[PDB]
Amino acid sequence: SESVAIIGAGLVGCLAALAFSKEGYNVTLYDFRQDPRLDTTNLKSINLAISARGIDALKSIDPDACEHILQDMIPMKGRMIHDLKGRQESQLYGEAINSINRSVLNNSLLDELEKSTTELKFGHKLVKIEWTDDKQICHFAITPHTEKYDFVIGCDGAYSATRSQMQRKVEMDFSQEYMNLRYIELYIPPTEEFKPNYGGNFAIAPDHLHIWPRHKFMLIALANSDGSFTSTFFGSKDQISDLITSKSRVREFLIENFPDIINIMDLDDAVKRFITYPKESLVCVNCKPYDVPGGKAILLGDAAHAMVPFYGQGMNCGFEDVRILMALLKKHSGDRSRAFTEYTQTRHKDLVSITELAKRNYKEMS
Ligand SMILES: Cc1cc2nc3c(=O)[nH]c(=O)nc-3n(C[C@H](O)[C@H](O)[C@H](O)COP(=O)(O)OP(=O)(O)OC[C@H]3O[C@@H](n4cnc5c(N)ncnc54)[C@H](O)[C@@H]3O)c2cc1C
């Protein structure tokens, strides 16, 4: 019965914590942010698209809770393209995706954890790790604090501190790249009345991923359960910077480029969101290997392969990481040293393809 320190209570980390509690490991999930469920309190997006692969990975870890967690997801049967004239054209789907709320999926995973042996330590920032040949010494900041574990699993985001600590122990080929891409989260409220055709209070087609393809920028919309739409604008930081110098400049920009949103969105609210948007940069990372030899550490999710939003699906990719790691662990009879090794040897070549294609689709647009 071994113990594991999982650094990062995000979607990937919480899932890994669930899959390691399922197998019998004494899991201890950490995160420097407070409990997201707590009212007194880190959402990069209101919702996201989960693929069949991301769903199958959910089932492989908990078939029961899966259909309970994903009970509010909305399937997309294709893309709905809005042109400059405001005309909509449907483009049916290769791989099916479903819209699901991020905070709900995150909280649901957390709830399933507290219904198990695992232990949740929020407000614990990992600062340092020392590597022995038996147990790893994890230093936190909450006020110094230290606990020892058999192995540490990093799921602490693109700026992974776990990754940095691993680099002091292993020769890691590592590359980080900051993109010009920026995103602004907008909101399309539900209609006042139920719409028979859409099957809810939706201003537009709920079973479609709406896209407003423009030159070097983009608007998208995913349906929420309550009828509203989570909307996201994608563009370079330069374009946005030039826009937000004037409320009228932003307002006239939206009307000109997305004329068919005037009936479904308050422009004054979108202008406000544009100007006061968190100017947070997007970074892409690649690692090799993802594991410390001896099976003492491993990287999953954005910590290992952070990629471009929309063009790449990081959550689905992160979920697939966990499922493959479990297949290997249950193929090598719990031998983490041999399982973590085969992970890198097989997962890296897939991740190289995925991240590059996503990066290639992005550079194409911009
Ligand atoms: C706008 C947007 C839209 C997206 N849409 C999709 C989509 O539709 N489909 C899809 O598959 N993906 C999508 N993604 C990507 C997806 O959100 C991420 O790839 C996914 O959340 C990865 O989760 P993670 O747990 O690996 O990293 P994170 O979500 O960042 O989790 C890391 C956690 O670790 C914690 N942490 C950080 N540092 C420390 C530390 N030093 N000590 C302790 N804890 C720490 C943080 O608090 C954080 O909660 C989107 C991303 C963005 C930005």
UniProtKB/Swiss-Prot annotation:
Subcellular location: Mitochondrion outer membrane
Any one GO biological process: kynurenine metabolic process
Binding site for L-kynurenine: 79, 93, 361
Cofactor(s) annotated in UniProt: FAD
Domain of life (superkingdom): Eukaryota
Reactions it catalyzes: L-kynurenine + NADPH + O2 + H(+) = 3-hydroxy-L-kynurenine + NADP(+) + H2O
Coiled-coil residue windows: none
Keyword annotations of the record: FAD, Flavoprotein, Membrane, Mitochondrion, Mitochondrion outer membrane, Monooxygenase, NADP, Oxidoreductase, Pyridine nucleotide biosynthesis
Recorded GO MF terms: FAD binding; flavin adenine dinucleotide binding; kynurenine 3-monooxygenase activity; NAD(P)H oxidase H2O2-forming activity
The keyword Membrane belongs to this UniProt entry's keyword annotation: yes
Listed GO CC annotations: mitochondrial outer membrane; mitochondrion; peroxisome
Function: Catalyzes the hydroxylation of L-kynurenine (L-Kyn) to form 3-hydroxy-L-kynurenine (L-3OHKyn). Required for synthesis of quinolinic acid.
Protein family: Belongs to the aromatic-ring hydroxylase family. KMO subfamily.
Protein name per its UniProtKB record: Kynurenine 3-monooxygenase
